[PDB]
UniProtKB/Swiss-Prot annotation, chains A, B:
Cofactors demanded by this protein: Mg(2+)
HAMAP family xrefs: VapC_Nob1
Gene that produces this protein: vapC
Family named by the database record: Belongs to the PINc/VapC protein family.
Lineage of source species: Bacteria, Pseudomonadati, Pseudomonadota, Gammaproteobacteria, Enterobacterales
Source organism of the structure: Shigella flexneri
Function noted in UniProt: Toxic component of a type II toxin-antitoxin (TA) system. A tRNA-(fMet) endonuclease, it cleaves both charged and uncharged tRNA-(fMet) between positions 38 and 39 at the anticodon stem-loop boundary. Does not cleave tRNA(Met), tRNA(Arg2), tRNA(His), tRNA(Leu), tRNA(Phe) tRNA(Thr1), tRNA(Tyr) or tRNA(Val). Overexpression in E.coli inhibits translation, leads to loss of cell growth and degradation of tRNA(fMet); these effects are neutralized by expression of cognate antitoxin VapB. The VapB/VapC complex probably regulates transcription of its own promoter. Ectopic overexpression in E.coli induces the YoeB toxin, but this is not the cause of VapC toxicity.
Triggers of expression: Degradation of tRNA(fMet) is induced by chloramphenicol treatment, suggesting the antitoxin is unstable.
One family name in Pfam for this protein: PIN
Name of this protein: tRNA(fMet)-specific endonuclease VapC
Mechanisms controlling activity: Inhibited by EDTA.
Transmembrane segments annotated in the record for this chain: none
Length: 132, 132
């Protein structure tokens, strides 16, 4: 059963083993984690813009194979639109991909594991954890 | 068979009947059009931030019922990440949601329908049409 949606920075922390606590908690929870395809997009971008696209792509693919990738669907989109409207009324800036990922997790009742929790606590009805 | 992925502005032009030519070309192509769930997100945002959320939401739901909403999946994400790396190297910017729909359309072999092209004309291998 899926319990966590990992943000991009948490994925990178796991991959770099820094902070090590993140990777250790990732390993603890193998089988219960997913990422949004929005996060997959960010990871692919980091690899393809790097000096070693093929190598870094392989790193991402190996990481991703240990988790599920969830399609950003109509429900995800609908929550996201609602959240953006709510954040705007509140005067609370969240980055555009972060907003999508928040909507995606909320639409699935998942905990967002991210390290910029102050910015995600600005979203209503969302549970977050920092494993770092 | 799906042939077109519509951008947000084209959806709005259709709903508002302005320009009326856009709505007419839309009706013409019913059964052949879709939007990315990324575009659905923007439309829901548009409604929930308005002064009449429930009314505008139903307007969007009614519009959306006549087309397909495609989930932003791994393939869409992958094309998006690549396009961003490519556009970055060319050092010419596209908005974050625009990049996603461009990636989504490319992953599906769809024509992206828009009102002010040029911004999508720089994505390699992407076909565009202007219905304005």
């Amino acid at each position: 059963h899926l319990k966590f949606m990992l943000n991009t920075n948490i994925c990178i922390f796991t991959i770099k083993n820094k902070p090590a606590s993140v990777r250790e908690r990732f390993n603890l929870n193998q089988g219960k984690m997913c990422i949004s395809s929005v996060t997959l997009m960010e990871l692919i971008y980091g690899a393809e813009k790097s000096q070693m696209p093929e190598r870094n792509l392989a790193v991402i693919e190996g990481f991703v194979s240990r988790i599920d990738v969830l399609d950003y669907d109509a429900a995800a989109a609908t929550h996201t639109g609602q959240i953006r409207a709510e954040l705007a009324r509140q005067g609370r800036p969240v980055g555009p991909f972060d907003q999508m990922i928040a909507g995606h997790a909320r639409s699935r009742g998942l905990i967002i594991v991210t390290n910029n929790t102050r910015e995600f606590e600005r979203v209503g009805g969302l549970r977050t954890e920092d494993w770092s």
